[PDB]
Paper text:
Glutamine synthetase (GS) is an ancient enzyme that catalyzes the ATP-dependent condensation of glutamate and ammonia to glutamine. The glutamate/ammonia binding site is gated by a flexible loop that bears two key catalytic residues: R299, which interacts with glutamate substrate carboxyl group, and E305, which is predicted to deprotonate ammonium ions to ammonia, enabling the required nucleophilic attack of the y-glutamyl phosphate intermediate. We propose that GS filament formation constitutes a negative-feedback mechanism, directly linking product concentration to the structural and functional remodeling of the enzyme.
The final reconstruction yielded an overall map of FSC0.143 of 1.95 Å with high local resolution values across the map. Importantly, this map, despite being the highest global resolution map reconstructed, did not display any appreciable E305-loop density, similar to the turnover filament. Thus, the R298A mutant, even in the decameric form, would rarely adopt the active-closed conformation, explaining the KM, glutamate and KM, ammonia defects resulting from this mutation. The KM, glutamate for R298A and L300A are outside the normal steady state concentrations of intracellular glutamate, suggesting that loop conformational control of the Michaelis-complex can occur in the cell to directly impact metabolic flux through GS.
Numbering used by the authors:
A (entry chain A): 1 to 373
B (entry chain B), C (entry chain E), D (entry chain F), E (entry chain G): 2 to 373
The structure:
């Protein structure tokens, strides 16, 4: 009732079948983002030998009508591999492949932002920007309520669940442990995890990652989480407000730095970037939402350790400010700063592109520059 | 619900199966029954591991129990045709696909591999290749699709095609196990994907040369059935498993020859399609085990399907009867896809009809007796 | 009843955990929260395996979520103090016990290890050793002891102490797993036994020198909680887990020094006890996390306990406040046991109080401020 | 799915309710709380059966517990306004609807009957009539519509509207009990029917004059809540209880005066419609219980719902804001229908707004403080 | 969960109870336990229906089994004091409340009616009136409030007070049955209402004169217990049934005399309040069955409760120890409220203390021995 029917099949049988030696053929799983801008799709292929780099993989295609990314006769779409990882659900030599999507006429799809993001990162390469993001999520049963919660009721009040240990403090640690190990095996740049303010709510961190690798790593981590939860029979949701009422919301803070900031006395560069950021609050708010600003309003309300969407604010060691400069970097006059505005279901390509445009290209206005800068 | 057998303790079975086997070898004989759609099997012991299919001995079975014979002369003969590694018992055990003959050594009514191989031997120098996409639906023991709400329906279509997640894909364990088992056995499996409604999947076979296509597809079907039996669910190839607005199942066939695969083979592809355009009724009859009934189940003109009453072709047209992939159009060489055959088709008959229509230039509404 | 998490097919988790993991290393930071009894943890990734606790980096956490801070200056600091092998993830992963400091680098209110180590450093030449017996009861998620009849009671006391059998011992799996995990991690675990009421157990730690006792006990408690979480039950250190005639839970402490261990140390033991006899109220206050409210619930004469307001000593008297084992008395050397501390005590405070009273000749109603 | 209270043995309750009660009489008071949508009740004993609402005494309740007052002066008084027979306890016990007042005798924030009554009295000579159609949905305690498959959906729309059969109508027992209870109580129920989705129903409150419309509708809502409590389910008036392609909820209100009812009243109906055409925003604000912030979820230009920002009217048109029944149009006399109000509206405010705009010729964006 | 007895078939019992009785009648005796807050009962057959309580004979019971006697002289006698009709077995059967006496005819320790009656008789000239409000909570047999989620909590406070609906009021059947049974029996049941948390309720025992107040309250408690026994649940008068941010339980007592009820009685009300303001500790001790140890958990400044040691009074103040209703203040007539007593108080003790302090103005720390 709380978990899916698939999860009640005998898994020893599956393990027995998966123990069989594979042979010479190699399995590859293609992954891409769909038309909703936040869903993922996948399908499997057979190769004659193990590819040594992403350049050796061939292109593929899929039917766009059933994905809501095309209509009419010209429904075929193209898949172009972008990044490759080791497959933790199968094992070596099988692979996972993240792909970009293009229309029949070879133009990028509406939900394909990696193209422009890669362009901008190539433009600003020399400054070595690094990114780190903290993804929050809630584990849910198949009945629409959070996993492990009382049937038609609520747990005790908040306070004992943040970083808690015990059968009555943390729900669903098996998924978390499995996800951690799977990401490490695949090669995702996972940096840590912790339990959140309300039980069945968790978080994992990614990075620091340079340039375009941040988005690839985050998306692959999301796919791995979904697949693991599917194995266990529960649902993982990135919704900014999973449960109504007093209970905690969900967000995705972003950490950003450059070589100048990481060098000695980089605090001046950090402050300059903060000042530049202060002028583009509405633009960045619009960027951070996949739907144009609907979810940002739902998240940013001033509660559950989140700032208020009304106005931009910054400070040192201020958890409630829009921008946070940690005390350690403040004391050492170097390091990084954290942006706490982006919502849990954000798009890393958009977030990173907006940050680069605002801070390093000195862009201004309400629209991005078309060709260059 | 799942079967009662699936609720027995499988650790016990694993304990027994882990015992060293010894010197004897098990072989499982497989054949097609009188309905033209079902499969049957039984096991025997051999003194040593065979090295090729020619070393296996002939066998027999009682035809009255499979509705393939009547009267006193009910004995039927099994003749091995192709051999594979057994994924349910591991080396050195084998799976054997056999042809069926009557007591007087004539082919059985449902034995089409005889004529299919006869025809294939005629055009060997042209190296025809085939590839087929088998769709199926996973069903519970109660007659409803696996994982669906009890006496209800899941959400509308759109999020299930190639989906990932507990609420978007049902029964991936069966799919993964089937993939691995086919790879171990040596079936030429090429890929898989989830389909438009949940609990519906597809796997692809090929490219396969000549007669090997039918053998490979039939063995893949048998392996799927055995795996589902292990898990306690039912796999159905019915063209319309669930009534109403939901998606139907089919089996697309891809076909090419050496000339088509050579540079500027698009001309040959076009001539083959032109020839195909004049035998629509014949091919429709060939694609159905019953003889022209199951075709109307899927060719209703909905959810990317062509109307059964008319023939059509195109490059990117998913809804056309014949499809030439866009990449094949851009590069003047490759293959083309036929979308008419139903999910419960017979590969021997399908491939024989394609060869007859395209390479032998046959005409009329009946096959040529001996010369073609 | 057991938790919902405990029904999630642990075979899947084992499959995932059997992966090689490559070159990165996981570290779990552990610390004590604002209630003075709870524990909290979170994980971090390191580039290589640390060889000693000195090369681990500092960290921080949000104090507002653990009631240890308020206002804007809610950031707190974590400073590693002791390192152990991780039994839940195996080598090369680690567990790290940390001290807590405020934003201004002052120790937190619940951070007693600072002063405890300060005091212990003044007596190092005397080599004090400690050993503590932790009791606990296993409880279901519904608030009743694990394995007890639903809304009922088991038979009366007598057959459960050190018992064996399905009807005499409840939950030995947790005990065995905890024992093995502590041995693997390197905790100085000395033994275990079942207690007077079913589902009630005890484990012993030591002998431990100086400050290591407190961290060993705390890490043992954390490991117990994690194991119970795996099995889906709750472990409680509450001094009176169930109302009525059933026995409470204590944390008897054993103490000795080099002089007592040496020949004819019984005289030193007697002087230490005579000194302890004059600070009953001070030690009672020290032994309780909340200032002395929980201890009154246990010391009532029953369950082999002494009166709360009366100090007494003896050799074989288990009902006295201080106990000198008979073998120690006969051999004129060894140790003595203090039976006052409650099950939810803080070892840092307990050991600090013992040291200050016995070896520093401290007197008065409050501890010495600066030194000694 | 159903509440724990509904699983108790109802035969025990019935045997208790069969006792003859004697000379005393029970009276249940009902009032509207601070949210403006919820209802509260409690009971007091009376010495003899009252024969007129004027005979019932005043009472009071704690306003701080219903979010209607704060501080020391939290007492609130309620004044009975209407009386009905009690269908749950039978004669001579009674139901009483009351108005709320602050510690100083001023109406509470959610007391709209006070002004509605004055507005009705200053127009009584024209004898306005009202008729309202309340839609609602039955929900289980788990949060899903009653009788729906767990985590799934029933078939598409089309068979449920005014349906009959186990697979087409869910929970008709509640509807029957409510209808009979209303008839016994004296509330004006005019009819009922099953709506476009299963577990969704509708009941009309017959033609009432002036202020009695709101009283009857509020008492009907209370009786529905009480009956659903007996059965173990929840009745919700949410305009959009289930997102997706599933029908929503509203409460249409029909209006008529003596002039319209008389011969050639169609011209007066047209005049009223023309007057209403210029107060769209004001009426939209008045019809939503919380200042025009919830009805937008339903009015979206689909499912025969007109655009929220666009006003339209027509004859026999169910897609317009205002509809003139075809029979009324043909007879040149009758009434007209307003389709804008949602399911959770306040009838007092709705009727007051209609009177103000159509009969008192008010034009401003705020109510006129003394008549018009 | 509910008791096993409540799952038996109640139709069988009803069939049996339908049998005509005959000439004999049953009488059920009731008396207060040795704990001072428990009730016991048993039944004897009588030849004829008694007309008045004076016709009932004396009886006895084993005091050693109720923990109010010891040794050989364990017999105890009970003397009937009040009689009512029996609602569980209809007319002519009866139930009788009795006083307890020792073997030597000295009143038992928990017999307070003996002295309460003397005080009331000595002060009868002024005709004191009393009214009390009993709060209680319905518990399942597993130890949690009835209808609460297993191991969880309902939503926060606010919707349950005087609530209606399946999700807002739990177990109204018990309340209805108890109300009707009390009315049939003949006790004053003045009214009822749902309380701040679900499964918590209140009933008020109407204006009684003299010891009749205590008699009626005790009989009402007995009736509640028997009805809850029929339904399978437990009723608890614990001051703090559920710890945390959840409402407690008290027993408010309203007092008045003829002078207070007469015109310009507010002066006497103020005089009585002033007299009470000096015996706060004495009244706190008297309002607790144990001697002033249980009400502490209730009075903490929360739930609108008064301070434990700071007496206060006011008009329309819920937070004060004594409150004067606003209507009483405005009319200069009526009564005043004492909000100190907890749920498990003894009405005889409460009324006796009020009489002693207010009417004959005692001042000592102990009750006066002779006629005071
Ligand atoms: N120099 C840097 N530049 C950018 N990001 C960094 C840098 N150093 C660390 N980070 C990132 O900061 C993140 C810290 O996240 P976390 O400690 O969970 O945030 P918080 O303390 O606000 O909860 C890590 O994911 C890490 O990748
Ligand atoms: N040269 C060829 N001749 C015949 N078949 C081919 C050739 N190349 C590929 N195929 C087959 O075409 C099939 C395409 O499968 P799939 O991608 O599932 O269908 P679609 O692209 O129509 O969705 C594969 O199974 C493959 O075996
Ligand atoms: N010389 C010593 N100094 C301090 N502690 C000691 C010494 N020798 C043994 N101990 C401790 O005494 C404890 C004995 O506990 P246990 O036998 O369970 O107590 P009991 O016999 O009272 O049940 C062990 O945990 C051990 O570490
Ligand atoms: N003369 C009238 N004045 C006011 N209301 C009327 C008059 N005649 C009928 N009605 C109301 O019209 C409503 C018709 O309800 P119903 O038939 O369910 O709606 P519909 O006609 O849209 O299907 C009834 O509630 C009834 O009270
Ligand atoms: N003249 C009076 N003398 C004594 N008691 C009275 C008098 N009038 C009313 N009461 C009592 O006051 C109580 C009022 O109870 P209730 O209204 O439930 O609580 P509250 O007054 O706090 O709202 C009743 O129990 C009733 O018996
Ligand atoms: Mg973080
Ligand atoms: Mg952060
Ligand atoms: Mg395909
Ligand atoms: Mg295809
Ligand atoms: Mg011991
Ligand atoms: Mg001991
Ligand atoms: Mg209608
Ligand atoms: Mg209508
Ligand atoms: Mg009251
Ligand atoms: Mg009161």
């Amino acid at each position: 009732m709380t978990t899916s029917a698939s999860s009640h099949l005998n898994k020893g049988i599956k393990q027995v079948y998966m123990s069989l030696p594979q042979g010479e053929k190699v399995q590859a799983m293609y992954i891409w983002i769909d038309g909703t801008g936040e869903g993922l799709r996948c399908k499997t292929r057979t190769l004659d030998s193990e590819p040594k780099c992403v350049e050796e993989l061939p292109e593929w295609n899929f039917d766009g009508s059933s994905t809501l990314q095309s209509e009419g006769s010209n429904s075929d779409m193209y898949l172009v591999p972008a990044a490759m990882f080791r497959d933790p659900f199968r094992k070596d030599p099988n692979k996972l492949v993240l792909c970009e999507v293009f229309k029949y006429n070879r133009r990028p799809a509406e939900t394909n932002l990696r193209h422009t993001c890669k362009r901008i990162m190539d433009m600003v390469s020399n400054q070595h920007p690094w990114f780190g993001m903290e993804q929050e999520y809630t584990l849910m049963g198949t009945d629409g309520h959070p996993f492990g919660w009382p049937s038609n009721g609520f747990p005790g009040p908040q306070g004992p669940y943040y970083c808690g240990v015990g059968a009555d403090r943390a729900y669903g640690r098996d998924i978390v442990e499995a996800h951690y190990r799977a990401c490490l095996y695949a090669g995702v740049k996972i940096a840590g995890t912790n339990a959140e303010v309300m039980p069945a709510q968790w978080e994992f961190q990614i990075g620091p990652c340079e340039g375009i690798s941040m988005g690839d790593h985050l998306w692959v981590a999301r796919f791995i989480l979904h697949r693991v939860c599917e194995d266990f029979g529960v649902i993982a949701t990135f919704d900014p407000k999973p449960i109504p009422g007093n209970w905690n919301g969900a967000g995705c803070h972003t950490n950003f730095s450059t070589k100048a900031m990481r060098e000695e006395n980089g605090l001046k560069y950090i402050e300059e970037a903060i000042e530049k950021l202060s002028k583009r609050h509405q633009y960045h708010i619009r960027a951070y939402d996949p739907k144009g600003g609907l979810d940002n309003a739902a998240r940013l309300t001033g509660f559950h350790e989140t700032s208020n969407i009304n106005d931009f604010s910054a400070g040192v060691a201020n958890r409630s400010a829009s921008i946070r400069i940690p005390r350690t970097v403040g004391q050492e006059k170097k390091g990084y700063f954290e942006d706490r505005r982006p919502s849990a279901n954000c798009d890393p390509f958009s977030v990173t592109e907006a940050l680069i445009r605002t801070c390093l290209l000195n862009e201004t206005g309400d629209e991005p520059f078309q060709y260059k800068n």
